[PDB]
Design a protein around this ligand. Structure first.
Ligand SMILES: *[C@@H]1O[C@H](CO)[C@@H](O[C@@H]2O[C@H](CO)[C@@H](O)[C@H](O)[C@H]2NC(C)=O)[C@H](O)[C@H]1NC(C)=O
Length: 361
């Protein structure tokens, strides 16, 4: 089973214990570590942060302790304009330039592959994505003739039904990609004036409208569109989504006035790291959706949808029963990487729970 873990560049700037460098990653925890967010300049892959080449180097040295560990560099991300991605892939000339620039860059910095994070091609890009993947893969095949191990090619793909139907030719891209990470953790979030969970496993016999907004439906739909199970990786989040309540109501359908207040370390409205949630829970009321199989907590006027060891173990069993290629974890740096906030002196408690179930079949 694969365990694919993202590390984010910007996590180094978090004050105090929140600061996270690749140095803190356990080399034996994951099978693949993906460094998040390379840029594109002058139609060529490029660094993002001022100290990226140093961090690339610190990350890739983990391979000295675990030579089976693979690393990938991810291009794109949220702060990357999808329009930008769109203009690059649309034009054979800018696209071929981008493609030819990738292998040498990957080789120079010690990466084993490229992860595409085009965050949402529209209906007009569907065809250009297919071309980009096809041609990127053909280039990696050619580049291996030089005697070094073929570069891996992956993509992060939306788990939203409409997003899938709109921008992705799954049957076509699946044959060229080594694995596909399903972003099954954005099924709700502040764009609605209600409370709700962003990563439920099952539908929730309760509602019925976006019967499509759960992990299970996303997985079944992808299988149906032609993605082979042995290439699909189910995303599991290590962060939570917070909301500020508009009333004293806390149950399903409770009105909302906006995202929750920022966490002391991640300083981003609407999101809390798992290590911040561990602190939040002290004095909070915990609940669990029986049908969706995920918990939530409340304290004062703050409502948090998150994943704990049990929800994470559950998702992992589920991907096991469906014979998927493995799990993807978004943000090693949002998990308790120091292992000093969540009671037990256990480093990476969410990710480890996942690894433990996987070590099982
Ligand atoms: C990522 O690359 C882009 C493209 O080079 C950079 O954006 C450029 O800003 C330059 C100079 O700062 C301006 O003249 C352009 O208008 C910008 N273009 C775009 C697309 O933004 C961008 O600064 C790079 N980002 C990082 C973090 O390095």
């Amino acid at each position: 089973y694969k365990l694919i873990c993202y590390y984010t560049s910007w996590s180094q700037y978090r004050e105090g214990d929140g600061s996270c460098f690749p140095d803190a990653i356990d080399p034996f925890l994951c099978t693949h570590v993906i460094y998040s967010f390379a840029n594109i300049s002058n139609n060529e892959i490029d660094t993002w942060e001022w100290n990226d080449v140093t961090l690339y180097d610190t990350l890739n040295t983990l391979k000295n302790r675990n030579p089976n560990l693979k690393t990938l560099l991810s291009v794109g991300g949220w702060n990357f304009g999808p329009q930008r991605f769109s203009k690059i892939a649309s034009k054979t000339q800018s696209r071929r330039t981008f493609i030819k620039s990738v292998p040498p860059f990957l080789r120079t910095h010690g990466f084993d592959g490229l992860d595409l994070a085009w965050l949402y091609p529209g209906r007009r890009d569907k065809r250009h994505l297919t071309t980009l993947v096809k041609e990127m893969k053909a280039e990696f095949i050619r580049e291996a003739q030089a005697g070094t191990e073929q570069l891996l090619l992956s993509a992060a793909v939306s788990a939203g039904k409409i997003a899938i139907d709109r921008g992705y030719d799954i049957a076509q891209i699946s044959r060229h990609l080594d694995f596909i990470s399903l972003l099954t953790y954005d099924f709700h979030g502040a764009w609605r004036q209600t409370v709700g969970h962003h990563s439920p496993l099952f539908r929730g016999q309760e509602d019925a409208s976006s019967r499509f907004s759960n992990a299970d439906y996303a997985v079944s739909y992808m299988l149906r569109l032609g993605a082979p199970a042995n290439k699909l990786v189910m995303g599991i989040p290590t962060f939570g989504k917070s909301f500020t309540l508009a009333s004293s109501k806390t149950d399903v359908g409770a009105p909302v006035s906006g995202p929750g207040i920022p966490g002391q370390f991640t300083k981003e409205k609407g999101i809390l790291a798992y290590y911040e949630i561990c602190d939040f829970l002290q004095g909070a009321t915990t609940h669990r959706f029986r049908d969706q199989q995920v918990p939530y907590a409340t304290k004062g006027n703050q409502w948090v949808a998150y994943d704990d060891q049990e929800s994470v173990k559950n998702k992992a069993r589920y991907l096991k029963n469906r014979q998927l290629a493995g799990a993807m974890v978004w943000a090693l740096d949002l998990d308790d990487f120091r292992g000093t906030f969540c009671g037990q002196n256990l480093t990476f408690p969410l990710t480890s729970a996942v690894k433990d179930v996987l070590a099982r079949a």
